[PDB]
Structure 1
Amino acid sequence: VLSEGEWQLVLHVWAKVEADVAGHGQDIHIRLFKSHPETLEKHDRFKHLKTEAEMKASEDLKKHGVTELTALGAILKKKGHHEAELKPLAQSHATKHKIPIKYLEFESEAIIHVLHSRHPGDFGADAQGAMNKALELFRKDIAAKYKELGYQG
């Protein structure tokens, strides 16, 4: 369980994300797609963007990142009481997009790296530790939802 203070650290750096959701989403995908090229294949519809500049210039990829980040933020704000919006997410990612939990750990690494690069003064050790906890709680719970629908994560 996260303590109240850890949820507050998570939501404090999240307010900084919400200052530029589109830019954060672009930077998280570029980082994810550079670190773990297998993960850009899964995003088959962006599979052909070759450079960071092309990635930034994609309004489609830009909107996609805002959609994912908006969904994650709504989850984080529930501070763990998030079953209701995990269910539709798990169903689409399990049965449609086919995303293993290790891809989710890859994306969490990219989130933590982008949040650190962009807001170090608002994202130090206690905060990164609280965000790692939040995202692993998200991974744990959705892994469970995966199983409930069949097919492992």
Structure 2
Amino acid sequence: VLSEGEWQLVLHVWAKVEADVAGHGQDILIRLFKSHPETLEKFDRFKHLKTEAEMKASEDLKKHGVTVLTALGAILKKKGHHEAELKPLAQSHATKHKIPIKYLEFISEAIIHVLHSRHPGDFGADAQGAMNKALELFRKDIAAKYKELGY
């Protein structure tokens, strides 16, 4: 469980992210696809993209980037009380998209990388540690629902 001080660090840097949700979303998905190519194969919608240039030029990729960060932001603002927002996400990613928990670890790493690159002043080590804990909490609760369904 995160303390109030840790949640405040997480939400302070997230407020900066909301100033440009589309730019952050695109950077995060591209970072994920370049670092872990097997994740791109899960998206029939984006598997035709081969180079980083093509990825940056895709408006549809940018759109999905917004969807991912808007959903994640709603969860973080609940400060742990995210049952209602996390349940539908877990169901779709386990049974429809078939996304292993390991790929959620990969995207958490991309998020931390991008936040460090765009906000060095508000994302020091203390904030990095808090963000890492918030994403672990996110994964732990997703994994419990995956286990229930048999994934």
* TM-score, shorter chain, exceeding 0.5: yes
| Deviation by residue 1:32-88 (Cα, 9 ceiling, x = unmatched) | 111111111112210111122211221111111101110000000000000111111
CA distance in 2, matches of 1:18, 1:66: 10
User: 1:54 and 1:23 mapped to 2: Cα distance?
Assistant: 15
Q: Which moved more, 1:79-88 or 1:43-52?
A: 43-52
Q: 1:109-152 CA deviation, whole Å, 9 max, x = no partner? A: 0000000001011101000000000000000000001122232x
User: What CA distance in whole angstroms lies between the structure 2 residues aligned with 1:11 and 1:148?
Assistant: 30
Q: Percent identity, please.
A: 97
- Could you report, residue by residue, the CA deviation over 1:87-109 in whole angstroms, capped at 9, with x for unpaired residues? 11001101111111110000000
Give the structure-1-normalised TM-score. Answer: 0.96
TM-score, structure 2 as length reference? 0.97
Q: Distance in 1 between matches of 2:110 and 2:102?
A: 12
Residues in 2 aligned to 1:43 and 1:73: alpha-carbon distance in whole angstroms: 22
Residue equivalent to 1:97: 97
**Is there any run of 5+ residues in structure 2 with no aligned partner, and where?**
none
Calculate the aligned-residue CA RMSD, in Å.
0.8
| Residue 132 (structure 1) aligns with | 132
**Structure 2 CA distance for aligned equivalents of residues 55 and 95 of structure 1:** 27
